[PDB]
């Protein structure tokens, strides 16, 4: 890692980690999420701001010093018309319109640069909110900016690159001596953003170092629901496939002859000129029951499923016994056994996986959907435990987890 | 011809002239038939199948069209070919391509099919009454032929009698995405083709024209075929240039006063008698759709609190209303409109929506599960929040309301209303005449006509009709004998055919003008109508005398 700013929350204390140790100033109005302290909350109030002051040999004043920045962010979807060309900035390192500033807007994160002279650079990155399912709304985004002085400033969006744009005109810099971590100039009164893991360099970030970066702050050794946050047991879980977003999870006949399959479409949610998604809150929702006195689920943990039928809970399971490979999956007031996967082999993740397993720990196989009859009921194949050898989109056990949230608008049924 | 007609006088009227009379009657229930088909079922095929509002697409009307060259094509042909082999033709066609018809998708060769089967049928008319003609004596020829015509009313009563029970939905020609079932145009198509299969099963017995024949040549034949004839009858009671100069010496030669006339008086018959039969359904809908119309209900600054709604509201318009908190579950839509509306949070579930239409509507945190309340029933909305769950596919409304079996109902009573008034032209003709009765009919419906301005009802309606249609089946059958006894029997064929065609154009005017002019008025088609009876009436008068 070895950075120049390393803002980290260690022992209910927001502090530098790096050897120069700048100071920390935090807000009244500044939360902080209690299942993971670094992960920050910011609105659009007054005292819902933080500073950073540097330390004057790390003051960024010079016109060929190349330098970066990462970060994660998260962004929630944008409501109302107002926050249309309305861009706030986020970020604030300018003194006397001279540094370098990270905003938003609707559907855009921003990265300017200006100099002395009142040259201005901007390299931007853009996502719809007119999508089926969209990877940058309301979830998890790791967002690293890299500028070189002399021929182009780059911004990578999870860990690949997304834009670039020349600086090399660009004269003398002379960048603020405080960090501002606050909203600023947002006419929507209620827009909030979370941020977490910023992190800065005094050098160029090539493309493997932030692929490195991108890894370590992955944190791979917990699942992950939708939005990118983590995975915790007794709390209801809707389903998404991935290989068919357009498809929910539905139950019949609860019992042991019952069965579970998948239909569609999903449905849509929309504001005119606003935003048009598909519906997220549908489907009979999951819950994982533990089989660590934490309430988070990490890898390589066996626990149990619960399907919510009616605001009443059944338990995941399968009998092996049935013919062919699938074990057509079921609901019982056996099988049950579930090992929740998230890193492959070695290195290799294919998004959150359930395996289940019998009692006596034979592999059944990974949870997926298959096509027996004109109904695609979830089955336990062992069809799938042999696909992932080729490190591909399994098309099948890769489940999605999406809790409630109010960063995404939707109300359930 | 003084040899033929005494030997044609001593066979007499038997068994014989009685089976070639139901053989051909058969013909001519098979051209009432696509009279129906063509103006009261393709007219109602194209109406949307999602709007209980739908007015008749006429698209269909090309097939009469086509019509009139059959009746010009194979109508003059059968004077150079014969009139057996020409009929057998022109019905043996119409039948395939009907059948054919049958088993279509898509509703572009569906109407070539039609179009098609018109240009086979439409030479069926001359040519079964010029056949028929050389057959009968000649004293006793006014009554059989005029019974002959009755045939022609009662295809279309059957036509329309046997419609309302397969297809009362209309809707049924532009869908071609439905499954394989909804196939009652199918089987309807399929059934309408059986006269005409019952008359080319039975046309093989039949044996030609003897007149003809004669004329011909090979005198031996027309001896043989009277003496079948004869002893039937005995037993019972113990090239074109050639047509285009036939078709010519029927117009510009010797007969040109008395085919002028003619044609005026047919074109005069079939513009009105063709207009009003259509007017009379779109009249009685029109008034249906009046009656409707005027109990609107107008909602104005409406506040709806944690309703919930289970019944169904029909006929109503709501502005500037403001239903917050609303629930709609298993209802139906029934013509209402919503405007300047502010819903809050409304649940909508399973709603069957017809008519139905959203506009300026401000739409805020809303579920609309499964539903039939598509986009393109929303004009000019905001949503906010709001969603769209899975909806039904398909177009749903309550048919029991919205159908057509107002309109061959009215139809089938039309036509029913000149069976008493046919068989007092039958036993008639041969004591007034083939000229007064022509004349006394058409002035006597022209009255009936400017009577109808005094009637808004659906039962003066549907008197009136009755009463036209009564005294209107006379003129048409003194109208066929007196043109089918002028012209020899070298033109005769010809002569009606082109009559025939012009009577086909005079109704795709009727059919256009007066089914155009609903809603608009109601005095100038019933003046026009009666304008153009009176004319005929009184030109009809301006013939030779047969008798
Ligand atoms: C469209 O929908 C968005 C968001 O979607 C909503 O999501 C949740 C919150 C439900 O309200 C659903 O019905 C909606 O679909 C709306 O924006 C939100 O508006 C609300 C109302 O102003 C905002 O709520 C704020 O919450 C602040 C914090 O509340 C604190 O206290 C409560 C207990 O009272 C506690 O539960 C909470 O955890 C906090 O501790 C509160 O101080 C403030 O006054 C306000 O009430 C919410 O923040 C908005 N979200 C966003 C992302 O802006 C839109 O208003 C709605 N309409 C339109 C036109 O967009
Ligand atoms: C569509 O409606 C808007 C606003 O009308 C709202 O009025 C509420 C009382 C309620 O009925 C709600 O359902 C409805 O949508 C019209 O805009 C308004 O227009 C007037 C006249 O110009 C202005 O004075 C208002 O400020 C303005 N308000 C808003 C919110 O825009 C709009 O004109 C109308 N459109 C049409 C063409 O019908
Ligand atoms: C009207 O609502 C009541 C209350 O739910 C319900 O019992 C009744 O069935 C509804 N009417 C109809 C016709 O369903």
Redesign the pocket.
Known sequence: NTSILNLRYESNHLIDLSRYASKINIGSKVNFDPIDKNQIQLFNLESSKIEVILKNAIVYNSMYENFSTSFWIRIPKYFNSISLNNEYTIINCMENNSGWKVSLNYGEIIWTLQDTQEIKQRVVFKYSQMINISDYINRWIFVTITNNRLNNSKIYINGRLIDQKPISNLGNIHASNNIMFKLDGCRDTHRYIWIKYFNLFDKELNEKEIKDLYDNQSNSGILKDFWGDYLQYDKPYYMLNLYDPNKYVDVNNVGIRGYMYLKGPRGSVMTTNIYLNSSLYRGTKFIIKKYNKDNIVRNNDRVYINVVVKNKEYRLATNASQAGVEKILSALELSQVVVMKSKNDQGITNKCKMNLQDNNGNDIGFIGFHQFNNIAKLVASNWYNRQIERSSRTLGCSWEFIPVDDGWGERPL | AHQYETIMDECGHGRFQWILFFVLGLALMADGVEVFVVSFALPSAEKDMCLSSSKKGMLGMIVYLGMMAGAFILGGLADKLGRKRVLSMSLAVNASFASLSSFVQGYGAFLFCRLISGIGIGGALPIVFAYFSEFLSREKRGEHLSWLGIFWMTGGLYASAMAWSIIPHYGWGFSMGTNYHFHSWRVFVIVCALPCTVSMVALKFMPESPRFLLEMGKHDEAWMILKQVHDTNMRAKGIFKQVWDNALYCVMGPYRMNTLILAVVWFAMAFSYYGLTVWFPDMIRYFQDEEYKSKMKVFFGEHVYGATINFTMENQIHQ?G?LVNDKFTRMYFKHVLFE???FDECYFEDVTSTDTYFK???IESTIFYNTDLYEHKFINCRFINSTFLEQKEGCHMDLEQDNDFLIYLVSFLGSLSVLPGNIISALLMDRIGRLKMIGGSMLISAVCCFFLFFGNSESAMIGWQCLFCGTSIAAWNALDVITVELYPTNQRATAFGILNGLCKFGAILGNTIFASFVGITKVVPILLAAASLVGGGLIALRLPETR
Do not use: E, S
């Open positions: 500037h403001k300047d509306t502010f300026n509507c401000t």
